[PDB]
Amino acid sequence: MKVRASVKKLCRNCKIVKRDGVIRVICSAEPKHKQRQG
Amino acid sequence: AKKVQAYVKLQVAAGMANPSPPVGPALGQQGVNIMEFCKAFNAKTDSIEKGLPIPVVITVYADRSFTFVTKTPPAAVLLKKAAGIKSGSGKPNKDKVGKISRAQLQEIAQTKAADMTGADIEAMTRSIEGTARSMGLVVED
Amino acid sequence: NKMDRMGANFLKVVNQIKTRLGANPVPLQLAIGAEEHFTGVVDLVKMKAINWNDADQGVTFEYEDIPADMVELANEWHQNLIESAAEASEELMEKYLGGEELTEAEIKGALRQRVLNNEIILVTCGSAFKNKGVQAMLDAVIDYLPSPVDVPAINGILDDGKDTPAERHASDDEPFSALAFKIATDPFVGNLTFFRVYSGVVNSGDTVLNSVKAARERFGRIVQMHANKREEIKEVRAGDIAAAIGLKDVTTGDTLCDPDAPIILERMEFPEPVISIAVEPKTKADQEKMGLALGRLAKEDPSFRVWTDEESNQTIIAGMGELHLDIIVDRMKREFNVEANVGKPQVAYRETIRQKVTDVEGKHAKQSGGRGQYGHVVIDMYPLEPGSNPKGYEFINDIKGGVIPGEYIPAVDKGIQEQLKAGPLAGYPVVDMGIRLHFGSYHDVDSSELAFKLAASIAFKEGFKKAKPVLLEPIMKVEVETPEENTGDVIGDLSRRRGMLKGQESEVTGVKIHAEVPLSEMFGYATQLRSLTKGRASYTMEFLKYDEAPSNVAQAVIEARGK
Amino acid sequence: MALNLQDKQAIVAEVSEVAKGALSAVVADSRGVTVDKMTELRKAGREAGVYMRVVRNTLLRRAVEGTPFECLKDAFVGPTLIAYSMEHPGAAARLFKEFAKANAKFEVKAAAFEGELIPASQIDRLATLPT
RNA sequence: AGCCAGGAUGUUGGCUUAGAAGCAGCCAUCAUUUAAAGAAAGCGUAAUAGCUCACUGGUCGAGUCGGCCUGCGCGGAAGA
């Protein structure tokens, strides 16, 4: 998981969820697009 | 079992019967062999194309044979061997992009309307006209 | 083998052999227990279950009763074996049709005949590590595999081929007629030649005429083997494998016999290697001490070819995989104590003009102060398309002005021959090249062709470089036959390399795919090919054309010498 | 855009072609082959006429509000997609013949010979006309 | 919003003429066939496969979709 401080929707199927105060990106296509903190 | 679902689009032109030699080997598995290497093309394509633009067949039958609903000559080879000019893509901006006439389009219908049809023989005429014309340009006749 | 391991099954393996390879396997055994419940083997002829003993004590058998957990399936494959054996001949079918089972002896003989005629394959199970099933496999070895004479009689041939020129068979009276099938490297006595005596009797020191290699040989000793230990024995007879010592001329596949000539045995076939690299010892002084071991190894092994190179001074070798060359390089370091550090084979670039002819001259004379006489010729640099003249050099004469001396015109072509072989681009032989000549200067005295040749040298080296030939790189015609699982994958690798491709045709058991690849890239291509398709691909690499490609590796020789 | 005003336009524009001629059809969205579908709507044109308009702008209520100023029961677009095909030449013309031939042969659905009707009399085809 | 499905046989494109593939480089080229042909979207894109840029009629009945400014927040934010 990337831990970049500026997470975006890098692809089509990368969505933005807000688990536990932190904004996480859960990508359903390429697990390279899992980025951690908003 | 169906129409051409062996769509490995690669072959020689209609000069030498679907020569793999000019097809190239990026084609995975399909079954071209000595059963139908020269089966129907060299028999009933002599009025279609011999050494000009030719999209190739990938058709196979339903009873261990090779048969399909065959069609007539390719339009981009009829309205281009009757037009002289071999343009189209490649130089479509500053030069003449191929000779496409109205009688050329009606003749392209008359030549490639055997089983290659559309909403009518006139719709297939619009088809072969888009063929001759959307190569990039046309001739003034 | 290896039933003892996790997920191991028997009927699935039987189905595998039945379906994939195309044969017909019949169970001669059924296994009691799959992974660790494996405790022994139940049979379908004896119809009794064997439970071997504990670790490394599996010598015993302890014949025991078939457990009821497997009685039904044992009965099913028993009857299936019964009918499949009765399938051998008619008198075994009707007797069974009468409501009576055949007996062990005739089932065994009938199946054994099936194996002789190569119709069937029998399967036995076991676990060579837990020491179970080995003896019961030996049981099958005895009961079903042909003995030397049970096999059809060997097809011997005279110096000419017929249906039965030399009907040979295993006999103490038959002529000594055998096949030297294996050589081995022995440092002590030089070589060590295995041979399987098809027919006859031969003794120590006795004569033998090498029917193929056209010489007579002798047997300094005849040693049968215990996997390494050479047992000294007096003589060897038919059906008895042995290793001959000292016979010099023979290599693999040759046929050794008496003077009565069953000279031609059928085979002279061996595969072609696919990997190639070059080698070099601790220093270039030991090169003969390296080529010597290489010669021994190439006389021992057929597929491994020591390949002295003419273009460069390297010694390249060819094998059938990364592992085979690896044993060879260590075996070379180990048995022949000269270590060779390895690299890639050098490339084979080339030179030729595109299409254009260019007019050029080169002038210099000699005798202004009374010296010897000169030469001078005008030339124009026309190429032909790659592959136009099969002879790499074609000439047309046009001398009309300053006509060079009557015995000097052919030497002008033969001197531009030197410039062709020289290849003023990077030293490489210019190919398909042509030169046309027009002018010059002469008298009716003794001029020097060498001056015309140097003159032609300056002319060649300028006019070629300014007519802009092409610096080509070796491109090979490739053929690869691989199953339909990784056609796309192997083609992908090829295109990532330099993929120029030929076509596609579906064989019975795969796909026919040919292509065009650079020899600068195909070096280690074999291991990668097999790794991309589990090693189910067949392929050979051969030359089709030379061609150019944008590459900054094109200056190595230019760096070593030349422009 | 499938708008309400443009739909009030297109519904009447599709109802006029059946208010001047004869019966039409539809075709659902369940199964269509490449060559079959292309050349088959092609042959629809070549047999019935250039009056083949596979348009689906007859929403199960939009048609019932725009076309149904007469024959108000036109909410039979509660079936699947609509590939319309009217015909000018006679009552239930070669277009309706294509409908009947494609309802069950070499196809998925051709509107199950629902057709249309200006007369809409008792349930019987028109074949009591010997010649 | 969820449930029913349809993208060539002119077009290995007239094509960097062995295509670079019915949707690689490369040019453009709806090409009527439209609940549709882009000479294309993720998988074969150097190949077909079954899912399919796109698009829609069916389904189903009250809200619905993106923006712009903005109050207040959140992550950024790790020491003895």
Side-chain angles (χ1 to χ4, degrees), chain A, chain B residues 1 6 13-15 17 19 21-22 24-26 28 31 40 43 51 53 55 62 73-76 82-84 88 90 92 98 103 109 113-114 118-119 123 130 132 136, chain C, chain D residues 2 10 13 19 21-22 25 28 32 44-45 48-49 63 66 68 75 78-79 83 89-93 100 102 104 110-112 115 119-120 127 130:
Chain A
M1 56 157 51
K2 271 196 262 283
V3 178
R4 293 204 285 131
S6 89
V7 306
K8 314 187 167 59
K9 299 191 191 192
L10 272 196
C11 54
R12 267 88 65 190
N13 288 97
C14 312
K15 301 175 184 313
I16 285 276
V17 196
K18 199 206 170 159
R19 287 152 180 182
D20 197 5
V22 174
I23 299 100
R24 286 170 189 275
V25 187
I26 48 160
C27 205
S28 164
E30 178 160 0
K32 294 196 168 202
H33 288 193
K34 226 178 294 195
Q35 37 206 359
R36 159 149 206 276
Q37 63 177 26
Chain C
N1 188 38
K2 306 218 189 182
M3 276 279 299
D4 65 296
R5 262 174 50 258
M6 331 294 267
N9 323 322
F10 179 85
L11 268 43
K12 185 198 73 177
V13 165
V14 167
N15 184 297
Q16 271 274 342
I17 283 178
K18 153 175 306 182
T19 44
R20 209 186 280 242
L21 299 172
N24 182 14
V26 191
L28 267 59
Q29 307 207 330
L30 289 180
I32 320 287
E35 302 183 328
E36 195 64 353
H37 192 266
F38 188 62
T39 195
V41 173
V42 70
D43 201 319
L44 301 181
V45 302
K46 180 72 177 177
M47 208 64 173
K48 297 295 169 71
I50 308 91
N51 311 336
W52 274 269
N53 217 307
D54 52 357
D56 76 46
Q57 281 105 32
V59 183
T60 197
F61 47 100
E62 288 292 45
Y63 262 125
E64 267 156 42
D65 311 0
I66 176 164
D69 61 15
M70 292 196 66
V71 61
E72 199 283 313
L73 273 299
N75 275 28
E76 172 44 48
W77 291 127
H78 184 109
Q79 191 203 325
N80 271 333
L81 170 85
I82 290 297
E83 80 167 358
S84 44
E87 285 169 342
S89 68
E90 293 88 352
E91 41 187 344
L92 277 303
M93 287 193 209
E94 170 167 357
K95 183 187 175 300
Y96 185 59
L97 262 170
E100 196 102 1
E101 185 182 355
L102 323 165
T103 300
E104 292 182 38
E106 68 268 21
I107 305 151
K108 288 174 184 185
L111 279 189
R112 190 164 205 277
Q113 197 270 358
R114 297 208 82 169
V115 184
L116 320 172
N117 203 6
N118 194 29
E119 187 39 61
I120 205 71
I121 175 153
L122 316 180
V123 307
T124 83
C125 85
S127 89
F129 196 61
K130 313 305 177 180
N131 299 317
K132 313 189 178 189
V134 172
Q135 289 184 359
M137 190 267 309
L138 269 188
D139 185 273
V141 189
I142 294 140
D143 272 26
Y144 297 88
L145 273 194
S147 77
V149 179
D150 217 328
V151 173
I154 160 203
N155 27 44
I157 304 146
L158 287 165
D159 66 349
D160 197 5
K162 304 81 170 192
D163 187 20
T164 183
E167 190 271 311
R168 305 302 177 99
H169 76 278
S171 175
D172 305 340
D173 194 337
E174 197 71 21
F176 165 49
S177 159
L179 175 77
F181 78 99
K182 158 159 155 56
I183 321 292
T185 288
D186 178 359
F188 307 125
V189 67
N191 70 353
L192 190 150
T193 293
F194 284 64
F195 66 102
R196 188 254 179 272
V197 176
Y198 269 98
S199 49
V201 182
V202 71
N203 291 42
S204 314
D206 266 358
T207 177
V208 59
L209 164 56
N210 189 338
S211 282
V212 169
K213 281 283 194 69
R216 181 185 304 271
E217 316 311 301
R218 195 152 64 179
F219 286 6
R221 291 158 45 184
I222 306 166
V223 291
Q224 66 154 357
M225 289 295 176
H226 172 272
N228 189 38
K229 182 186 230 202
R230 290 149 278 204
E231 275 101 354
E232 188 48 44
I233 76 186
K234 178 47 178 94
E235 89 291 5
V236 299
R237 294 186 175 91
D240 188 328
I241 288 176
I245 310 305
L247 80 175
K248 307 157 272 167
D249 303 317
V250 180
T251 179
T252 172
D254 310 348
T255 297
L256 276 53
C257 59
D258 299 340
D260 57 22
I263 293 180
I264 300 295
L265 280 210
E266 39 195 20
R267 178 201 143 252
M268 213 55 225
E269 163 59 30
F270 49 84
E272 194 64 28
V274 293
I275 285 291
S276 313
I277 56 157
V279 302
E280 202 276 326
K282 66 180 80 173
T283 191
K284 275 188 47 205
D286 309 65
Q287 295 305 342
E288 191 202 294
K289 287 183 63 213
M290 196 255 291
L292 208 65
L294 256 174
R296 310 192 68 158
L297 265 295
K299 289 201 166 189
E300 179 186 56
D301 207 317
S303 70
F304 168 85
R305 332 284 170 78
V306 56
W307 195 245
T308 320
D309 181 85
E310 314 273 319
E311 181 177 30
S312 157
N313 56 5
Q314 57 184 14
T315 302
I316 79 155
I317 54 191
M320 293 198 63
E322 54 93 21
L323 209 154
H324 179 268
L325 285 199
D326 187 26
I327 255 63
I328 295 303
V329 69
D330 65 52
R331 259 267 273 96
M332 187 184 131
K333 171 170 162 157
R334 280 278 287 97
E335 278 212 16
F336 304 81
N337 76 330
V338 58
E339 75 297 334
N341 300 315
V342 288
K344 282 196 297 180
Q346 315 298 102
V347 291
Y349 305 149
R350 273 148 69 111
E351 317 174 8
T352 294
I353 325 166
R354 30 192 193 183
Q355 193 254 310
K356 193 46 155 45
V357 76
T358 75
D359 304 330
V360 59
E361 75 93 26
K363 180 158 190 165
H364 183 267
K366 194 187 169 215
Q367 67 266 0
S368 171
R371 316 173 219 185
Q373 299 188 356
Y374 63 74
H376 165 80
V377 176
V378 156
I379 57 146
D380 304 337
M381 304 288 215
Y382 75 94
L384 317 180
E385 60 283 4
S388 178
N389 43 353
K391 332 296 193 201
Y393 200 39
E394 193 35 72
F395 203 93
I396 296 154
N397 62 84
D398 300 67
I399 279 298
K400 187 222 291 163
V403 193
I404 44 166
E407 311 269 18
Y408 285 61
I409 307 93
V412 172
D413 181 27
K414 266 199 70 153
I416 302 195
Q417 184 53 278
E418 183 282 316
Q419 305 151 11
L420 188 85
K421 196 84 170 84
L425 171 141
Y428 295 111
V430 183
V431 299
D432 272 19
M433 165 60 173
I435 188 53
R436 182 257 192 172
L437 82 172
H438 194 192
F439 263 47
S441 88
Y442 88 100
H443 213 177
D444 301 327
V445 289
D446 291 333
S447 65
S448 297
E449 175 57 40
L450 321 157
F452 289 95
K453 142 126 216 63
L454 178 71
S457 79
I458 302 166
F460 202 91
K461 70 97 174 179
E462 296 151 322
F464 212 74
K465 175 184 68 174
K466 307 327 287 164
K468 191 58 182 173
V470 176
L471 172 49
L472 292 76
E473 63 156 49
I475 308 311
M476 323 308 280
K477 177 211 163 201
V478 176
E479 175 268 330
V480 300
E481 201 278 346
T482 185
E484 50 261 18
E485 281 88 5
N486 309 339
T487 74
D489 262 345
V490 58
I491 288 287
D493 169 82
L494 264 185
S495 180
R496 311 265 268 290
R497 296 229 156 170
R498 280 301 183 298
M500 328 174 182
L501 323 174
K502 284 266 275 199
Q504 148 57 41
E505 289 183 354
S506 157
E507 188 182 359
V508 172
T509 42
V511 307
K512 187 66 77 176
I513 289 180
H514 329 271
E516 314 83 70
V517 196
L519 192 49
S520 157
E521 293 206 324
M522 291 272 288
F523 291 124
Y525 167 58
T527 74
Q528 273 76 342
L529 206 180
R530 279 202 270 281
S531 158
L532 264 297
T533 182
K534 315 183 182 164
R536 257 179 301 214
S538 41
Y539 65 98
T540 66
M541 159 261 298
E542 280 296 332
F543 162 79
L544 183 139
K545 70 156 179 144
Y546 287 94
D547 202 312
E548 53 208 273
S551 59
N552 273 335
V553 59
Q555 73 277 350
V557 267
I558 311 188
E559 151 193 335
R561 48 167 169 175
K563 296 224 60 183

